Amino acid sequence: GAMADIGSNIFYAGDATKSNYFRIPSLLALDSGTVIAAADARYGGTHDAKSKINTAFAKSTDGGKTWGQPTLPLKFDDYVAKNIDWPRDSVGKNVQIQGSASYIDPVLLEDKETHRVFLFADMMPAGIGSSNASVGSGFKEVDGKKYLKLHWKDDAAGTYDYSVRENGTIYNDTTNSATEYSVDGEYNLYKNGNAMLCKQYDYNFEGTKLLETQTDTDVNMNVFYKDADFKVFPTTYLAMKYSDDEGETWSDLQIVSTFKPEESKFLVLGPGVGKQIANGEHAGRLIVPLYSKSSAELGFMYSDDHGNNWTYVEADQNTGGATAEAQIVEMPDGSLKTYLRTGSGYIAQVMSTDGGETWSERVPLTEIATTGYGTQLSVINYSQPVDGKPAILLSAPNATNGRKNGKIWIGLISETGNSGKDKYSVDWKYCYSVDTPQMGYSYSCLTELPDGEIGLLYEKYDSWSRNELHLKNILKYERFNIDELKVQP
Ligand SMILES: CCC(CC)O[C@@H]1C=C(C(=O)O)C[C@H](N)[C@H]1NC(C)=O
Ligand SMILES: [Ca+2]
């Protein structure tokens, strides 16, 4: 590293998370000027779920110069958290942990009006990822109310005759009667008030074989685990916790995906950050992007009551389940513009004028080259005008083969003199090249730091390629002043 690269990683092999690998950056400057970040702590190489992944978190209280040790606010204990080198040979590289639960793909959002920070992540039961998730919500209705459903070990396969009801009391739904079992606020199981326990797994390679084996370490038996007497429906869930002390402590685990459509396979986060609307009637509305294999691809969840209740919106009718990861910016009057990945070989744009309740048709963005699978992008508002115009910024790779050639762009917003979704246009005037065109560049997250500089946390390799799996120390943090970025090539 150069002098300029000192301090250019927040999370790294050897830090407090005990992970050798990381992916999926999230970076967010708080209204206090505290700056925070989160990423996946991918213990089992860089694989997506199924695997063993916890959500890591870290804070800077000097404007994003300096970063404290990381914490793990969303973590599962069914398999141990340890530093391990994942094989990168031609056979071993493909091997994933088969039996762990996982938190994956974070989103950070602050409510400025209460000063509350929300951390969201996808929540995967044991041995589950997007690709083997079962179709369904994971909840049942009993007399109209939604309860998390559960499979007792000695019931028939696919049979969920039990539910988590008030106080965490587990009920038998065929008889409608409370059992002697319950869950606590961590979703750990209890029998007649006693903590139920199971053996933690360790994982070790012998050659290219991954041996997942019990240790003698006891942990709390959790309904998300492979070895639980009661087990959740094996679909994807949305998890959230909030903090009122800038990440010093977290609230109890929330499973917020009660709205998961019954016809959906997966419903997951567009990682990065969410948005709080600043202007218009709905200033203070919290909105978070989602996508699904369902009736719809692109979706959102929003809250009008400071995060207590969330509404799900579908933004299209696509049943294809493409990887429609999105990030959202706001126009000067409070309307919203969302940029998203597609499975169509371009980045797309959609608009809402009612604060995220309804969305226009997808409009391709021709300025940026991408692959047919796409990559996640980061888009943010900037608080200072640029050339006297309102400004947004976009980070993304810029190539048609591979994840490489990262740019940061500056888009200047103009009134076109038209009414609805057509009220504004974006001039992508500036395009800054992060590195040499062949250097890898995948997922990224921008934030505006309190001094008006731009922070960036990004994947400095190609995270799609099967030949760049299981690299260490590829999550890079850089800072730029706005004049550096005002490049026209
Ligand atoms: C969700 C489907 C999609 C299938 C390729 O995977 C996403 C692609 C990713 C990618 O293109 O690198 C990273 C995301 N972490 C992953 N999401 C999940 C939930 O695993
Ligand atoms: Ca309001």
Key structural traits:
489 residues, mainly beta, Neuraminidase, Intramolecular trans-sialidase, domain 3, 2 domains, 8-stranded antiparallel sheet, 5-stranded mixed sheet, 1 helix, 43% strand, globular, binds the ligand CCC(CC)O[C@@H]1C=C(C(=O)O)C[C@H](N)[C@H]1NC(C)=O, binds calcium ion
Q: What is the compact description of this entry?
A:
The chain has 1 helix and 35 strands.
Helix-strand layout with pairing:
Elements: E1 21-29, E2 35-42, E3 53-60, E4 71-74, E5 102-111, E6 116-124, E7 139-142, E8 145-152, E9 162-164, E10 169-172, E11 177-183, E12 189-191, E13 194-195, E14 197-206, E15 209-220, E16 230-232, E17 237-243, E18 254-255, E19 267-269, E20 272-273, E21 275-276, E22 286-292, E23 298-303, E24 311-314, E25 326-330, E26 336-340, E27 347-352, E28 363-365, E29 378-386, E30 389-396, E31 407-415, E32 424-433, E33 444-448, E34 454-459, E35 475-480, H1 482-485
Parallel strand pairs: 5-20
Antiparallel strand pairs: 1-2, 2-3, 3-4, 5-6, 6-17, 7-8, 8-9, 8-16, 9-10, 10-11, 11-12, 12-13, 14-15, 17-18, 19-22, 21-22, 22-23, 23-24, 25-26, 26-27, 27-28, 29-30, 30-31, 31-32, 33-34, 34-35
